[PDB]
Design a protein around this nucleic acid. Sequence first.
DNA 1: AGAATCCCGGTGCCGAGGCCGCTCAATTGGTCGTAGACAGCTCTAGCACCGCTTAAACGCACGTACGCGCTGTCCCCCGCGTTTTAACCGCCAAGGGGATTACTCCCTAGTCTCCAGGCACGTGTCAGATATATACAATTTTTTTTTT
DNA 2: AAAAAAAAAATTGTATATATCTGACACGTGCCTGGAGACTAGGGAGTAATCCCCTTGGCGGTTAAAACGCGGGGGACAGCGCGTACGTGCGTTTAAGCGGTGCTAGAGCTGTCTACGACCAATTGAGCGGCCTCGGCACCGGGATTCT
Lengths: 104, 105, 95, 97, 83, 78, 334, 92, 93
Amino acid sequence: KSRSSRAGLQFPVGRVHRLLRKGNYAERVGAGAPVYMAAVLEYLTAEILELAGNAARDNKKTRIIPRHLQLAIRNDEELNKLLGKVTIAQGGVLPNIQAVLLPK
Amino acid sequence: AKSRSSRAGLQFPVGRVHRLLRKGNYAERVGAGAPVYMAAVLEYLTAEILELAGNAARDNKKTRIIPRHLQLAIRNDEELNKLLGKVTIAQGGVLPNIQAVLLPK
Amino acid sequence: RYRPGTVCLREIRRYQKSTELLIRKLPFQRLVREIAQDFKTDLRFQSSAVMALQEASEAYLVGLFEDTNLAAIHAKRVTIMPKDIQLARRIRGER
Amino acid sequence: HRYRPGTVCLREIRRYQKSTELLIRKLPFQRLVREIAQDFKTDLRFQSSAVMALQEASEAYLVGLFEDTNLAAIHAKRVTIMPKDIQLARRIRGERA
Amino acid sequence: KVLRDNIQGITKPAIRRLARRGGVKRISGLIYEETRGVLKVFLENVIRDAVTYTEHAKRKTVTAMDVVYALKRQGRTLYGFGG
Amino acid sequence: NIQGITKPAIRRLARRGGVKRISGLIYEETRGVLKVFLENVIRDAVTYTEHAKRKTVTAMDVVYALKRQGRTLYGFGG
Amino acid sequence: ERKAAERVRRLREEQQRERLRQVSRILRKAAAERSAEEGRLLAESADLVTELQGRSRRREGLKRRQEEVCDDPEELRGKVRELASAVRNAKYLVVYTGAGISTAASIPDYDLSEAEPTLTHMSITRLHEQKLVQHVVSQNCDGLHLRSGLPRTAISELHGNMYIEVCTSCVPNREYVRVFDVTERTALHRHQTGRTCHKCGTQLRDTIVHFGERGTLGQPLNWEAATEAASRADTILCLGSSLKVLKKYPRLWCMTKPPSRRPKLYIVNLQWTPKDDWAALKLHGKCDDVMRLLMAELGLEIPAYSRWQDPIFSLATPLRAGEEGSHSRKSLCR
Amino acid sequence: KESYSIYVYKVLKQVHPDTGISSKAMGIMNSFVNDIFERIAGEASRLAHYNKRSTITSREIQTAVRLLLPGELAKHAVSEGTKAVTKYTSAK
Amino acid sequence: SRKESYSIYVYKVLKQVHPDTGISSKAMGIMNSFVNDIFERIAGEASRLAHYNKRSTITSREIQTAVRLLLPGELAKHAVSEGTKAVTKYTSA
DNA sequence: AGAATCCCGGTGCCGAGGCCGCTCAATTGGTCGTAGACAGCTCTAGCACCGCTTAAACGCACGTACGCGCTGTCCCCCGCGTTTTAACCGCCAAGGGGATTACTCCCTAGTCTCCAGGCACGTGTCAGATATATACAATTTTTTTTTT
DNA sequence: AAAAAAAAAATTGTATATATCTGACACGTGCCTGGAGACTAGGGAGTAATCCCCTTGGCGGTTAAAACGCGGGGGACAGCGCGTACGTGCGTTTAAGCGGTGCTAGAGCTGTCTACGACCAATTGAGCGGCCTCGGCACCGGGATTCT
């Protein structure tokens, strides 16, 4: 009967409610705003984990590594735009060889 | 002395900055000496920028400072450039510079 | 007739000393109205916003201009080529 | 035999873009971190976590600088890097005014 | 009236003047269209952020304040227009 | 003391960047730039240190320093 | 260094600026108007007023260069006697027509058809029939020297003769003459007479060259012919020249060859020019009067110009059909 | 210390039941979730300041979601959030 | 309604530095933007670091640290000294 | 033919997901002070149009300086071998400082009352535009002279 | 006889002095709202004590890593020839820009009244700390395929 359950969402909302109230963001907090924040959170987590799992399966691996999430965050343009200035731990770089440097 | 600015010998307001601090949603309670520090650092920054602006003004035989003059002042200071090399000034232009390789030989 | 380049540097310094605005207001205003009408129809703009857009666009374009100038002079060239702007934009962090 | 110059370069490029291990030896790094930090005040203590954070942050930022310089070099119609490429990178990214 | 054919409203001498302010001595013949494209993409970005800031306040008129908030949102704070 | 970064290490970290050829005047400028960025980050971290009345700097302080420069790093309690 | 150090050396720069501005202020006002105690800084800075007087005197000297200078008629006629000896003794000689001769012939100083050859052109032509003068280089673009009777090979014009037009199509090129001036049809940046050749049938190109374009035809006017004529001369002469047009092209003088090896050069002009002081013999006077007096020592009468006697009209080819309405200025009649 | 480990794990099991995950990648996930938290809440805060309002609601944060995130992603997020808040308000 | 600005105070400091210098309106706009921008910046890192060390109060120390954060070496050395003498002058009376 | 890399199998080993237990935090419930949703009135700025004077854009052609390709040179890193060396692991000791708990002083918030500093407004007068008419150092290019 | 250097003059922007006027900056004023003076209360912060986690330090092995030398080959760089694309100037066309003139959608403020969010006592379960057990993955090695 939790608010996460009556909302159908997974991440906590009362936790979000408190950390909004103690966040020094406003003297008052709305009611459905943390439900929104949790929903968009589950979204972004869902697609990042989707593409991370695609990367893991592409390497014939059943577990995740920072390398796979790096590949996932680099291959797609939208998440690259979002994760522009962010440097990832143990991620590496996309393999790329420039054309005229290759032998003829 | 009644005004707090005159009490500390500062020329920016203490009540106004204190009110901005309280009505800023930064902390639920505020100390007493913070506005004095704020006014002091504001004095220092505004004074140092206006000094070089006036220097630029008397450089070109002009008695009135213009944001072009402030642009000249801000682009020729090593540290203040690190302060605000990030910002953009209105109708400020650019300092003249030509690469030596571009000059005729 | 002056040798080729003296007029170039003349214009360089003439507009380096200048502080005014270098794009005609009516065409760029028409452009901003056209590009903005794609998001919500029957928009109304005020003058302050359009001169703000003036100044911001001019500042960016000037900045990327000396950036490409540096890129081109690094290429032992005096001519600027599109590869210069593609490099400048790639390495600045956009795209 | 003797490989033509470049085959080993491509091999090492492939192996190092397939690896995620830290690249520089740790003890010289702790030495340099201590010997740059002690100048502001004396008698400091450090933990391993901060040191590795500094290590991998520096490694990422530097490798980024290097693809930047590589683009500058290939645009320069060259296959060899020179200091002026790094100077141009510091010009573009704006950290150096 | 619907607006079309206005990216060409920025003229070749204007771009030449802007390049001269940039400190450039020679201009290639293939620069103008790509400068136009860069200007188009940056304008679309700034107008999108500004217009979103505009309907956020339930307003039907764009504000220069919205423009300022957007421009410092792209980390391009601009001086002398309030704020 | 700055010579502690060996030439082979610089060569390898240039390899990871995709470089094939290295000049003879690269190492000193690499050392200088690393020195200056390290001194920036350590200044920020040490200031964060004396603020809160502790004699030892923690890793999360380094995380604060790097996130201030828009260089956020993951996997260390961020 | 220290920001206090920044302030202090800014202050010393300021005191340098104020002392320079106040020395300038003390310099500006005249000594007579100012008080005795004032100007002591100016008095000790006597070098400053020295270069101030130098500036004043050099502007005055430039003004004297522009303004016309006269010499005494008797010293003029003596120097012209020496000039007559020099022109008689030389087997080959070159004379340079000048812009003073242009002003005498109403040609602007540095229409054209209505202008007639001046009496100076008469005297130069007379020298040519006497063969004392072998070659002449003309500043003026009028072609009035050709009207005077000058042999076309003997006269070389760097601007070009307005009446003559030379086709650019043919490699040897085709030479035609038209009495009327063609500046009305011709314009800057375009080099076409618009008159088809009677034989070739291609549009002619006027021998005159405008300002801002280069003539690519050597037949209308031959540079190396003028250089060789200058070299062959035992001595070089110029008369009534502001010289600026001849200053434009050095080769026609052959100034390139060393002053010692070249034939000695003398220039006569009412207006001052650098070649005037460069010349060993200098004469200040009106060019027409000087040439008349030179003819007087030579004992040979000055010729009288006549349209029938002017060669250009007969050298002129008949005008193409329909070209009469094309030109704004009417064709000359002999 | 507080972390979102269990909730993220529920998201995994609802999307990928047959998948195993380490702890480091979880640290990256926690840092990522916190980061978008500060971005979204902070820009909502400047929105509340800008319009001279003192109450935080769903409107400023939904506009923020439109603001920082690309078109397809933005429309998906706003649609899901509206359906979630409507479901929340439906049951009391 | 009424609008708040810094015109009188900055004009006073103009007199204190330069008694015989004028001013323009665009100059007032740009300096007002400067004072605002620096104010929210400094208060921003102050609030962040006050949250950071789990303290609910803000004083001279956190803002002194913030000044030494964003301001380069010599400028910061001057700013800390001026602020200290100012605060001791205020608290002494 | 040949070294370098992908692929399959076997074995060991420590982290990952479960399970147990407990405690602070999420949830109910009610209640009271308070912000904004809505209507309405108002006043102001953006839009649209018109006419006109004029400065800029354009099209063109001509020339020439530059980008580019090619050739020759020389030269300086690369790959491999061999000697050198310090990094890393594992282990063991010791002291400091980070963290927690308890406690008492005192500094900000809050409220009321009263006054003076800043703001909107108005008017004078003077610094800078604006046109007009000029000086002026730098430079640069050409000529002339000197040296080999 | 030819090349290089110095001087002088002519350009070339480059800077300038000055008469008129005009609109914008500076100064005077009423007042009203925020800032200042005084008192109270209460929770947050400064200070003392403890410990045990952790950081610093030392030492022996060994072992991969680093350092140096040398032959050589590909790459950088300079020079030359040539085609052309772009600078530059002039005649022509166009639309930007200023000045009124008018309208109206639309921002801003005012009033209220109700719905919504803060506060606090009870209370109960979901989340966090410890321990485990065992399987997914690393490691050494053998073989399968792949550029040179």
